[PDB]
Ligand binder design. Structure first.
Ligand SMILES: O=C(O)C[C@H](NC(=O)CP(=O)(O)O)C(=O)O
Ligand SMILES: O=C(O)C[C@H](NC(=O)CP(=O)(O)O)C(=O)O
Ligand SMILES: O=C(O)C[C@H](NC(=O)CP(=O)(O)O)C(=O)O
Ligand SMILES: [Zn+2]
Ligand SMILES: [Zn+2]
Lengths: 153, 310, 153, 310, 310
């Protein structure tokens, strides 16, 4: 039931459909959350128009189901985006990434003298809506950074 | 079981005004009537991967004052971690199967936090982790502060020096922010200014703070003048301009000093506090040092002993 | 013109269409080809079925036509790929990647003591089909490597 | 203009059989008919970023014999590339606006090739780039092989020692493969074996080559025994097992050798050749060294002179 | 005798406008009319107690181009001043009994001036004394500015980088102040600002100069953009915050620049000029380098020749 404007086949049984991802984001989300390292059928649509959502982005992973845990972690890059639960062609569910309280294994603490870089542990940051931006606080070194300076993998 | 029993003591950010008041009250009872065998049969690991004179020696003296035994190292050079490439995680893994509690100082931020993740049931007491926290120092500062001011609420506190790298001021500033009406005055060079996260925490709780270019600019309205050393060993090359102390405290500077105001310093001091201050009734850093014994005995008693000391 | 064979197919007017991209390679070319820059309705199809060939990845970029070299550089990461030049919903030109004589810039010389690392110059290797693997000779250190080793830049 | 006029001498792999023959012929003439002013008014830069005795000294000596002026450095420690962080590209870019030719030895393979991209019309002669090529060495070896055997065809040649890191044998082999019917015998430790790229080339040309675990196996068949030094400065820690010479030539092992076989060595020798070999008609490494003067004058003469008539 | 015959070239501050003009005129002639024997039979000492590539090599090259002999050292590590404790005065006293002129670069300001007091009739040419003067550099810059602008008057010149430790800009500025209507633009970090003694001089002469925090501010007005390297080897630990280049020139920042503006740099460049600037009509640092041969031959010719007629 997508839309209309010159046909092309594109519909799947079960799986997830992250929708309304802002420009130059669909690629990032694909890399960070390794949402591509799978045997499942994926169909990324980049830049495809959507009214107010002028140049939106789209990702569809077949047979793959996210979790309140995962979905929320998207609120850090594509907050407005909407995650649609498609089971048997029918859109059985529909959520929206809300700010999670802690991101794990993804980012890397910008503090170079952080014990987390040397030892065999997984990174972790407490998320906080500071003022203009989101502040990230390392569980270990306890320093906080604008969610913008923090890098990842 | 008292609140802090078997509890890890990593950051003052994890404790509450209650946990602190408890430690201090206990500190005062133990100073009054010593308990020589309270920790009889306990073996504590004293693991310092970074230099120390007061923290380690006071800590270890405290363990003995309470009848406990001490094992450990004062330098990582001869540990297997130092010569065989062993990770800190594995070190704390095997160590935690020998002793009842672990006290550790380390050069990297978060080291103590990391230990709690591999220490099993054994508690970890942070004796200093890089430029992050230093809980037991703060615990003795508060003890000393209350001992000299009568209270910990509504105080005019000035912290001079390296606030950026001073793990002591990080902890202490968070501690006093748990009490009411404390007025803060930060006097540090621009490159070594108090970190943002601390200032934000201050704003949120509506605490009042202000920056000042000189000691004299606040000498008349401060109860506690908390002097710190420039963390030379932690500075980046691009900050070597601040290796020497910009604010040196001299006796003459204590003329317009409030009679009750004491001067504190977590130590060691280099040249930021001239020796003449040593014999003025305001100097209190050596008394302060001595209090580390009571604050550290108190802390150990609560973590390794179930019942609130009788 | 027409409608593809398999189901989920995407349509476009003019642009390029890389097909037969091996599995787990589609997302990579998307990286070291900086295709994700062009804000042109891009369409990626990961893990699509490939008849007796198993599974293929497939990229589609409208109003974009690969460089005068990219197809040759594309010959290394995915030899059995095909690049279709589609103008006005029609294949006005079909191509197959051909191994060039030498490849410049993109590759990094595996020899650590090669001067190409320390100094400000573009790398370049002389390509040469050997026995099954492609042999690459460094323009600088003159050492020859197996493209297997080299593709670890 | 002669074929080599203004050409860069970087890798033997870029010279043809006729180019090589032209240098040897010329070397023959200069060795018997000196040209004290052939290069009067030219200034040549001798730039060695790595140790050297024979190559640098023989090269600069050849320049003076031909009346040229020498300028340069034998240690990069005092250049601005050494103390100021300047890149090699910039060093070559400015130096090339001062001199007429550049002789260069560098620790990293490809340094000479790189120089040609920044030297403009100024030709670059590769005196050695890491473990890659050593062109002028091969020219003096060829000259020496030819004067002792009267030919560069159908020779039975054995190369012993570190063949992996030996730029000398890398260039010498690609040269001898340009002639006909030469048979190669490679005796080296597995870890320091001859690179594959050179062997693929030998096969490509249908040249007969074989491996042997001892010198005694081939002693009665070689016309030239080429001894090399284990390239210690280039070894990888994982190869420190081969620093000691595996194959050592002593005077005794020469009993069943062809009367016309000569023992060659690029030098310096460490322990791979006993000094008692020095007093035998076979030892020719020092004569080979002296020939460096003639081979190198020829090259300089041909590169800086459009027309040469001797 | 020409004005410069036998004079010491120590500081630009001791040369007049006519002396400078004499060197440039001569440089012009030698660049077009070579004098291969102008200095036949002279021996010049090239003494560098500090690193160098352009200055030493260009100087010695110029000596050979003019038929002189060179003698000296590029590293004081092996002189007797280096291993035996000999003073600089004694080094210059004996060396001056061997040679006809002395070219010297030293780590401490004033080393050249000192040499003149111990060299007798032997003239001393200052190739650089610490962060003080760099006379021959300024001569080649002037020559280069003049050939690209056809004048040394009413030029809009910007000097960027480390102006405090840059002997190059110290000498270049005192020179350009000897001409008329030149306007100076100084862009440098506060810590590495232009010394006051030079500015007092500019004011004294009523010369227009101004400071700017970016290159973009003056890009469309300069005729010469003079880029310098941060003098790391001379920085004080308290200045290690400025080792990284603050002002970096890229090809893009050149869009609104005068068509005739040239980018100059004494070299070496570290990161202050992106290499993409190299391919633009504005980049002229390498041409400037080559001009060092002509400026320096002229100086040598004028100092060692009583009468010169070219
Ligand atoms: O050293 C300082 O000034 C801060 C703080 N000081 C102390 O804890 C006192 P000590 O090194 O004697 O244990 C520290 O990091 O050790
Ligand atoms: O060093 C060797 O053993 C072989 C060869 N030897 C030489 O060039 C002799 P030199 O270093 O004395 O000029 C080399 O590649 O450096
Ligand atoms: O070093 C600089 O950056 C400027 C100037 N540069 C030079 O003289 C170049 P060189 O050291 O290669 O002769 C100097 O004062 O040394
Ligand atoms: Zn951290
Ligand atoms: Zn290479």
């Amino acid at each position: 039931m997508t839309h209309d404007n010159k046909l092309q086949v594109e519909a799947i049984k079960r799986g997830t459909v992250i929708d309304h991802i802002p420009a130059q984001i669909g690629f990032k989300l694909l890399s960070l959350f390794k949402l591509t390292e799978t045997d499942q059928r994926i169909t990324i649509g980049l830049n495809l128009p959507s009214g107010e959502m002028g140049r939106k982005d789209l990702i569809k992973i077949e047979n793959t189901f996210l979790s309140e845990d995962q979905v929320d972690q998207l609120a850090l890059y594509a907050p407005q985006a909407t995650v649609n639960r498609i089971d048997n062609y029918e859109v059985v569910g529909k959520s929206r990434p809300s700010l999670p309280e802690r991101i794990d294994n993804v980012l890397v603490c910008p503090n170079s003298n952080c014990i987390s870089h040397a030892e065999p542990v997984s990174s972790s940051f407490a998320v906080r809506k500071r003022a203009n931006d989101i502040a990230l606080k390392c569980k270990y070194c306890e320093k906080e950074f604008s969610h913008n300076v923090v890098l990842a993998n | 079981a008292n609140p802090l029993y078997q509890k890890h003591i990593i950051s003052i950010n994890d404790l509450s005004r209650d946990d602190l008041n408890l430690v201090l009250a206990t500190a005062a009872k133990l100073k009054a009537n010593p308990q020589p065998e309270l920790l009889k049969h306990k073996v504590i690991a004293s693991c310092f991967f970074e230099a120390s004179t007061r923290t380690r020696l006071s800590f270890e003296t405290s363990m003995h004052r309470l009848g406990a035994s001490v094992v450990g190292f004062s330098d990582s050079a001869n540990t297997s971690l130092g010569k065989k490439g062993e990770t800190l995680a594995d070190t704390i893994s095997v160590i935690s199967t020998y002793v009842d509690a672990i006290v550790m100082r380390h050069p990297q931020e978060g080291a103590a936090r990391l230990a709690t993740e591999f220490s099993g049931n054994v508690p970890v007491l942070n004796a200093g982790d890089g430029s992050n926290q230093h809980p037991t120092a703060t615990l003795l500062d508060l003890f000393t502060i209350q001992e000299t001011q009568g209270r910990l609420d509504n105080l005019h506190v000035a912290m001079v020096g390296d606030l950026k790298y001073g793990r002591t001021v990080h902890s202490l500033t968070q501690a006093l922010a748990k009490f009411d009406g404390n007025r803060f005055y930060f006097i540090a060079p621009d490159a070594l200014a108090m970190p943002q996260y601390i200032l934000d925490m201050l704003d949120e709780k509506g605490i009042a703070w202000s920056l000042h270019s000189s000691i004299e600019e606040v000498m008349a309205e401060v109860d506690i003048l908390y002097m710190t050393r420039v963390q030379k060993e932690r500075l980046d090359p691009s900050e070597y301009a601040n290796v020497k102390a910009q604010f040196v405290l001299r006796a003459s500077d204590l003329h317009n000093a409030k009679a009750n105001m004491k001067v504190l310093h977590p130590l060691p001091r280099v040249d930021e506090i001239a020796t003449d201050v040593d014999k003025t009734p305001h100097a209190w850093y050596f008394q302060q040092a001595g209090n580390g014994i009571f604050a550290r005995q108190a802390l150990l008693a609560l973590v390794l002993n179930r019942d609130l000391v009788l």
